[PDB]
């Protein structure tokens, strides 16, 4: 009946949804592994592709939609020269310092359009050879770089395949002051994480253009998975020989709150789960102690995350955790109107016992 007990009940409800999600993921993994084997056997620019096992499913925070999965295929690309397209670090053009990708160049710039067109062509050919699972490729949607598989098991599962370039060079200068984990996971962890590769994912800017179509966004999905699964100041946080915290529980509740609100109000189309993830990264930095995230504090921790998110909405400021000058809540990206509408809705739920969770 009480507020704290109701929030625990929501987490139970989310726990129950994970069984269908896990079962669907087994089918997705079967298909993805079959497709990757075919891609690794075929001679092409994409022969070196591998699954990057990142994203909400592998972070254990996929809370809904067992019929929709996102999968990343990484391709190592040596000697990438990056050019900032936005000096905030929001977008990059890829250039090079013979080139295996030389067929995808528009002058000196790597064409995401050309490279994705061949990627899609090959995936479509190889998926047709998968004879023992019912799987097809969804017709291409303009503005959507994903190559989407449709699996029927017998129910339909959609799998968005995202091509990600992997660079082993040092991280871009736009990330210099990002990943501010020094007081939480520490300086040794930060140094080790920044020695890992980084990824580039195709994404159109839509603006004055010229090179619209050929821009890429940075991706740190591997780092984010590491942080989600190694999220405590104590190394034993949430391990068998350690103490549970409520960090991931707060993430799941806030993701669910946003997902429920977005279902009801098309005014919220501009918001996405990555805004919640980015906000909770900042909150984990602000409140680094595991004791601040004791399971008994679930309700007060969720409330302080809501308060922090409301402050980001009010100030129209939510910095990308890895790229500090990239403001995800800029007036340019999300109307002041949309932020005020979401602030009103979150405040309502907060002061009335979260009726949208009852749905
Ligand atoms: N607007 C965005 N800006 C930057 N990265 C984004 C954005 N939207 C999604 N991502 C990327 O999505 C990755 C997470 O993949 P995932 O499969 O969890 O997709 P999702 O749509 O964010 O998740 P969910 O289905 O749980 O809501 C993150 O590593 C992040 O880099
Ligand atoms: Zn923990």
Author numbering: 144 to 240, 245 to 506
Reproduce the article's own wording on this structure:
Cyclic GMP-AMP (cGAMP) synthase (cGAS) is essential for the host defense against cytosolic double-stranded (ds)DNA arising from various maladies (e.g., pathogen invasion, ionizing irradiation, and genotoxic chemicals). Upon directly binding to and dimerizing on dsDNA, cGAS cyclizes ATP and GTP into 2′−5′/3′−5′-linked cGAMP, a unique metazoan second messenger for initiating type-I interferon (IFN-I)-mediated inflammatory responses. cGAS is central to antitumor immunity, host defense against an array of pathogens, and regulating autoimmunity. Here, we resolve these numerous fundamental mechanistic questions in innate immunology and present a unifying catalytic mechanism of cGAS. Finally, we reveal how mouse cGAS achieves more stringent substrate selectivity and higher catalytic efficiency than the human enzyme. Together, we set forth a unifying catalytic mechanism of cGAS in which dsDNA-binding pre-organizes the active site into a rigid yet adaptable lock for two sets of keys (substrates and intermediate) necessary to specifically synthesize 2′−5/3′−5′-cGAMP.
Moreover, soaking ATP to QN-mcGAScat crystallized with and without dsDNA showed the productive (one Mg2+) and nonproductive (no Mg2+) binding states seen from WT ± dsDNA (two Mg2+ and no Mg2+), respectively. These observations corroborate that the QN mutant is well-suited for delineating how dsDNA regulates substrate binding.Fig. 2 dsDNA regulates productive vs. nonproductive substrate binding.
